[PDB]
Design a protein around this ligand. Structure first.
Ligand SMILES: Cc1nc(-c2ccc(C(F)(F)F)cc2)sc1C(=O)O
Ligand SMILES: Cc1nc(-c2ccc(C(F)(F)F)cc2)sc1C(=O)O
Ligand SMILES: [Cu+2]
Lengths: 188, 188
């Protein structure tokens, strides 16, 4: 059979209900995450091939980057709440990993202000119930799958993508194999 | 006191005779090691604060990454023998952890070739007894400090850095304390 358990994906021993259809975890400190999102365009592709009515969810994790990692999880909650994911993702990756100009919560705030968000509005969002709830949601989701590393992607809280088990030579084929695996799993 | 045994550092029960003054262990498979290099630049910041006449030594370890881990220790021995550590450290870290394009000994070699090390020069070093000795040297040093994990740093075969006991509330404050602790220990 084309798709084999342990090859393109693994099956969670204890799946959790109410899980997002397609859930991606990442960290702005995570170099392979940077590669997935900005070089291979994994999420772009996944989305291209997702069936109708299937949405992609992406959460940040706390466990990379020391305490700043936690601030980045809250900043990502702000990005989701304000709908600016597609404006701040590059300056956050670049600021953490490339130029190393993001070292403190204030440096994160500066990225949002530089992208056109008013400081007063960033601060209001930062302290909002929506963002507090989103932070807890991101942390619970990681706990629910006993998440130990990123990048990671889960389908319906039942299956975990296993890129290590895919074609690791031809990246164009790899990227579509990853996307096709998500599509196939979503149809299960 | 400001510096305390059990705080910023610990004391080896069995001090190592003839150890390097400042000895750092890492693996190209080690995610925290990637951060120590690329994001914190721990070695460089330790170096710029060390007294005159104190040299720094950095060894690779086998215990991460199985077969390729051992290949990387041998390649690091080649890097040391040829004096090209600064040319290959970033592309080896990125090849293993960011792009995941390093999967074999040949892929490791490609990094050196792309960095300008000639093919015959690399191969002659790889197969040399000088390099065999450097591999054994790295392994023996790890055994002698009873190494359990990386990153790790040891001063004068007597003291082990304990980043857990440092000010980790800011990554730059942390790097500063780490480097200042090494300086303190080197003067001790
Ligand atoms: C547990 C641990 N955690 C470390 C760490 C945390 C954060 C960062 C950075 F913020 F720079 F990304 C680097 C290393 S090193 C380390 C160890 O095993 O000594
Ligand atoms: C050994 C260690 N090392 C840690 C660490 C090092 C650096 C940083 C930062 F750079 F982010 F400030 C955070 C935590 S936590 C930790 C532990 O296991 O207790
Ligand atoms: Cu089959």
């Amino acid at each position: 059979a084309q798709y084999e358990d342990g090859k393109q994906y693994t099956t969670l021993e204890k799946p959790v209900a109410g899980a997002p259809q397609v859930l991606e975890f990442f960290s702005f400190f995570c170099p392979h995450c940077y590669q997935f999102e900005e070089v291979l365009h994994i999420s772009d592709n996944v989305k291209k091939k997702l069936p109708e009515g299937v949405k992609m969810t992406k959460y940040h994790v706390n466990f990379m980057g020391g305490d700043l990692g936690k601030d980045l999880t809250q900043a990502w909650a702000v990005a989701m709440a304000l709908g600016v994911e597609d404006k701040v993702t590059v300056p956050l990756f670049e600021g953490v990993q490339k130029t190393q100009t993001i070292r403190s919560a204030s440096d994160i705030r500066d990225v949002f202000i530089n992208a056109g968000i008013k400081g007063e509005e960033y601060d209001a969002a930062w302290n909002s119930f929506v963002v507090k709830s989103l932070v807890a949601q991101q942390e619970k989701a990681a706990a629910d799958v006993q998440l130990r590393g990123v990048p990671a992607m889960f389908v319906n809280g039942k299956y975990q993508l296993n890129p290590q088990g895919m074609d690791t030579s031809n990246m164009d084929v790899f990227v579509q194999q990853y996307a096709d695996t998500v599509k196939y799993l979503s149809e299960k």
